[PDB]
Amino acid sequence: TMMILKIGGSVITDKSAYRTARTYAIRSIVKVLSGIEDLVCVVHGGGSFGHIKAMEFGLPGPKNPRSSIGYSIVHRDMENLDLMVIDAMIEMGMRPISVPISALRYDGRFDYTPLIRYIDAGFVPVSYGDVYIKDEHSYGIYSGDDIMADMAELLKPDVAVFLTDVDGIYSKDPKRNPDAVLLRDIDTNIGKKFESMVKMKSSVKNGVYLINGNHPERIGDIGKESFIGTVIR
């Protein structure tokens, strides 16, 4: 009855302002996560601790002096964000342990052996969108969503949840066009995330959910008539 969960950068950071964390949201979300008894792995996105320097330094992209310096900066930044989520989890008495993708062997897939040892021993491993060395000439950025896809394939969990700062997948950006309709249900019969969630669904028995991280208690409404967000089925 395992759950894997991603905390979206859009909801724990202000995506428009470099290194701006939203501490309340982090705490508010972690409080709900700590009550989830079968939560086995947490991932988080980077928002303003990721995307802004990545774009400025040429990540992902060819290796060169600027992108090599950017590699160290973006990872350091993502570590700083990660420690705020780790501190909140420790406060709620969880047993988190961060396992950064940057520290794993990569040979086209990442060697998640250390993360699986942590789950087996009863920890909740925490990982996050990160830089990695994709090949001799290229640095890549592996996103929180890519990590979720990988966990979904490896663990075959019962449920996978993504928290973002809107209520679900809509017909159109609910922030620009105030008309947009909520797709409360998508049948296997923002664009890249949607594509990853659909792909994942074939490994996730009981559905992949997008939920508003600003109302994290909605996670407890999964499977109930009061649920608000998107289920991919």
Ligand X SMILES: Nc1ncnc2c1ncn2[C@@H]1O[C@H](COP(=O)(O)OP(=O)(O)OP(=O)(O)O)[C@@H](O)[C@H]1O
Ligand Y SMILES: C=C(C)CCOP(=O)(O)OP(=O)(O)O
Residues annotated in a binding site: 6-10, 46-47, 51, 144, 165, 170-175, 193
Q: Is the bond into 178 cis (omega within 30 degrees of 0)?
A: no
Stretch that binds ligand X, among 17-25, 39-47, 92-100, 130-138 (CB under 6 A): 39-47
121 binds, among ligand X, a second copy, ligand IP8, none (CB under 5 to 8 A by kind): a second copy
Should residue 9 be labelled a site residue for ligand ADP when binding is judged by CB under 6 A?
Answer: yes
Shortest distance in whole angstroms from residue 111 CB to a second copy: 6
- CA-CA-CA-CA torsion for 221, 227, 229, 233, nearest 10 degrees? 90
Should residue 125 be labelled a site residue for ligand X when binding is judged by CB under 6 A?
Answer: no
Q: What is the 3-state secondary structure (H, E, C) of 117-147?
A: HHHHCCCEEEEECEEEEEECCEEEEECHHHH
74 binds, among a second copy, ligand X, ligand IP8, none (CB under 5 to 8 A by kind): ligand IP8
CB atoms within 10 A of CB 122: 8
Should residue 150 be labelled a site residue for ligand ADP when binding is judged by CB under 6 A?
Answer: no
Q: Which is nearer to ligand IP8, 26 or 141 (CB)?
A: 141
Instruction: Tell me which H or E stretch contains 61.
Output: strand 61-62
Query: Nearest residue by C-beta to ligand ADP?
Result: 8
Should residue 233 be labelled a site residue for a second copy when binding is judged by CB under 8 A?
Answer: no
Residue 68 to residue 70: CA distance in whole angstroms = 5
Residue 209 to residue 194: CA distance in whole angstroms = 11
CB 33 within 8 A of CB 94: yes
Q: Which is nearer to ligand ADP, 8 or 216 (CB)?
A: 8
Residue 104 to residue 114: CA distance in whole angstroms = 8
Shortest distance in whole angstroms from residue 195 CB to ligand Y: 13
Should residue 20 be labelled a site residue for a second copy when binding is judged by CB under 8 A?
Answer: no
Q: Residue 172: helix, strand or coil by DSSP?
A: coil
Hey, which residues between 135 and 174 contact ligand X (CB under 6 A)?
Answer: 143-144, 162, 164-166, 169-170, 172-174
Contacts to ligand ADP by CB under 6 A: 8-11, 15, 45, 164-166, 169-170, 172-175, 190, 193
